[PDB]
Design a protein around this ligand. Sequence first.
Ligand SMILES: CCCCC#Cc1ccc(C(=O)NNC(=S)NC)o1
Ligand SMILES: CCCCC#Cc1ccc(C(=O)NNC(=S)NC)o1
Ligand SMILES: C[As](C)(=O)[O-]
Ligand SMILES: C[As](C)(=O)[O-]
Ligand SMILES: [Ca+2]
Ligand SMILES: [Ca+2]
Ligand SMILES: [Ca+2]
Ligand SMILES: [Ca+2]
Lengths: 88, 88
Amino acid sequence: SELEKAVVALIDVFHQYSGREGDKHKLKKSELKELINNELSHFLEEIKEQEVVDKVMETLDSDGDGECDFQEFMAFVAMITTACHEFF
Amino acid sequence: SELEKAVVALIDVFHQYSGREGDKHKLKKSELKELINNELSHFLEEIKEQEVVDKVMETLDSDGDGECDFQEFMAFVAMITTACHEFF
Ligand SMILES: CCCCC#Cc1ccc(C(=O)NNC(=S)NC)o1
Ligand SMILES: CCCCC#Cc1ccc(C(=O)NNC(=S)NC)o1
Ligand SMILES: C[As](C)(=O)[O-]
Ligand SMILES: C[As](C)(=O)[O-]
Ligand SMILES: [Ca+2]
Ligand SMILES: [Ca+2]
Ligand SMILES: [Ca+2]
Ligand SMILES: [Ca+2]
């Protein structure tokens, strides 16, 4: 179904980005930035400044380790979906 | 992108199911049951018993109003994705 498709897309995109460098299970700042810029260009403004990279991670980073893990990525997804859900 | 596709699929599926009866913004038990049975047949066992319908809603229903709203649907999605994410 389309829902099952969306579930595996969420898994797949996190993984193409998280596995690039360092911890293959977490998104560092440069990997988060590339995900947003390449994969969310219709929902979010392109990130061009280091201070925005820094602030975005600061916001997503619930447990405070400096990176975005899968659960944190999932909360980020829920935020965008809710924002899109109620624009309409 | 495939991620933006997944975001709009999440919105769309909740809405086709929630708007069927009563509150057009919330999933009652029969609407939740149909969503899981029709749209999650590869991830979850088909629900055939009222006690399972009752227990599933009890689990998803964080604020205690007897129905599943959008934020609660989003937490349910995060649970299935995490379960699927780490099966592999
Ligand atoms: C082509 C679709 C564009 C039409 C549209 C839209 C729209 C309104 C608000 C958002 C959005 O996702 N923002 N996310 C935020 S503010 N951060 C969590 O997206
Ligand atoms: C065709 C794919 C089947 C292969 C597979 C798989 C798989 C393992 C675990 C789950 C799952 O989503 N369970 N969700 C639960 S337990 N409730 C929150 O799915
Ligand atoms: C070694 As690689 C292509 O996952 O950065
Ligand atoms: C009136 As209807 C087709 O949204 O249940
Ligand atoms: Ca990484
Ligand atoms: Ca973190
Ligand atoms: Ca309803
Ligand atoms: Ca509820």
